[PDB]
Amino acid sequence: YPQSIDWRAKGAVTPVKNQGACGSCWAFSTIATVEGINKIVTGNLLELSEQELVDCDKHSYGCKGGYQTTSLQYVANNGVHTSKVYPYQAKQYKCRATDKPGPKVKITGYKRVPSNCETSFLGALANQPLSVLVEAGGKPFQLYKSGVFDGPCGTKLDHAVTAVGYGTSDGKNYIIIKNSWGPNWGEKGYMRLKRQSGNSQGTCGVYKSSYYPFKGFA
Amino acid sequence: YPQSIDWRAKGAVTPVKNQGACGSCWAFSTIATVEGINKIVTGNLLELSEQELVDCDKHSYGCKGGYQTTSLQYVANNGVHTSKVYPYQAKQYKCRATDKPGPKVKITGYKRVPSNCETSFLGALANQPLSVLVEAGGKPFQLYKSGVFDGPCGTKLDHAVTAVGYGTSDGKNYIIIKNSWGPNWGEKGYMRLKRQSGNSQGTCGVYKSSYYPFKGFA
């Protein structure tokens, strides 16, 4: 893999969104990875529907939390509609996927990045954005404004975000994270998270639970 | 269905191509329908590879003829590459589909339009372009320049073309056919073929063997 990569610069990342007061982070993270792989495979960057996952992934809890695996499986099985067609409401309603037009973007399946390992993480991120989990509940994380964040934070995973690149700055290796708290949080909605080397759980548990979808066709 | 329809006007038809001195009409017809459904489903008009079918559909005979069913099945199973990536050579070579990048457009499957019936034909053409067979070997068909062609021609099917619309002109109902003989033949590469009413084999056997692909995902 290269010394650095930024999928935003490669046109595989849509603008920062805001989950509002709804615990739909799991949906946002899954959608960002799907938007990314769709662009990488087809060349087109489409904004996909987090709302469809919120309403339709029956294995998740809408605004009360959900899972990376079940939401990615949902897209692999059913495809996902565009957000234009199924816009975000920050609330869970009845699944309305069927009454929807436009295309349904589908993925073939998803894989798990071998955990707690910087090398595996970078090797996979060099190919496409990853859905990752982090402990974001601590005060420092919440109030992050800029720079390479290195805590303090533990590994009590409670938030799903999207890794969209990595690199180094001022003698510090980092990972670019796209959060779903709007453009006012952090560095225009992103955070450069310190990259722990080798075999470790990662800063705020970033290497513990990473997944990526794979898409073989258009 | 409407009184008339023209998929060219709806942006679902790529420019007229020329099979050259290669009996790859079957590949051209299949590709035109796939290009059409892809646009209808995804909104993007991509030019797909006839060459991939020529080289890769092992059930067909390259430049010596082939089938509507086997070529459509090929795309349903393997998807098809863009022509940019796998350009036409008017000759059959080794299948080179695997060493190719870019996306592979796939279809879910294909269906047969109930034969010898104007109503079924129009009902299906109102939804998307159709792969149809016609007897094009006769002198009149070969030398067609303009107007609503109504023969003479029999029903000895020997050529595959694409139906891309229908309508009426000067008291005559017709079907718009996209041929693969270049832009100099007929009406800029197209032919308005007389539409026989009801239960009949159609002018030049146009209602005898029509198929269309269906695509459920992007």
Curated annotation (Swiss-Prot), chains A, B:
Keywords: Disulfide bond, Glycoprotein, Hydrolase, Protease, Signal, Thiol protease, Zymogen. One of its GO terms (molecular function) is cysteine-type peptidase activity. It comes from the Eukaryota. The active site is at C25, H159, N179. Disulfide bonds join C22-C63, C56-C95, C153-C204. It is an enzyme of class 3 (hydrolase). It catalyses: Specificity similar to that of papain. The keyword Signal applies. One of its GO terms (biological process) is proteolysis. Belongs to the peptidase C1 family. This is Chymopapain. The lineage of its organism: Eukaryota, Viridiplantae, Streptophyta, Embryophyta, Tracheophyta. The chain holds residues 135 to 352 of 352 of the full protein.
